[PDB]
Amino acid sequence: SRMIFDFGFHYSKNRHVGGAVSDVPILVVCEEAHNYLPRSGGAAYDASRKSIERIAKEGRKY
């Protein structure tokens, strides 16, 4: 999740030049989610549950 997010974050700047958006969109397919994205589980399922929430708010911008 992070090795991708950061890639797009960095790449955006050059292209994004005041009146356009990136030309390299990216889609992520999260299958069978409730395993590693529960409502309430142990700390084990925290890492994957945070790098994701990031994208859920500020990925559209990149």
Partner: protein
Amino acid sequence: LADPRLQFLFYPKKEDGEDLATGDFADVVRQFVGYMTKSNVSIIDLSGIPFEVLSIVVSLI
């Protein structure tokens, strides 16, 4: 310094076509106003310009 777009910033020149001095402040302000007893408007276009200096400009003004 090479970037043309960023000239009004780096090499601002007046009607004379020469750099401004410390005494040219007041005129810089009127640039956004006009004068006191005359309804006026000021508009500012920003198309070819990136998003890293936008905020700087805005804060300054």
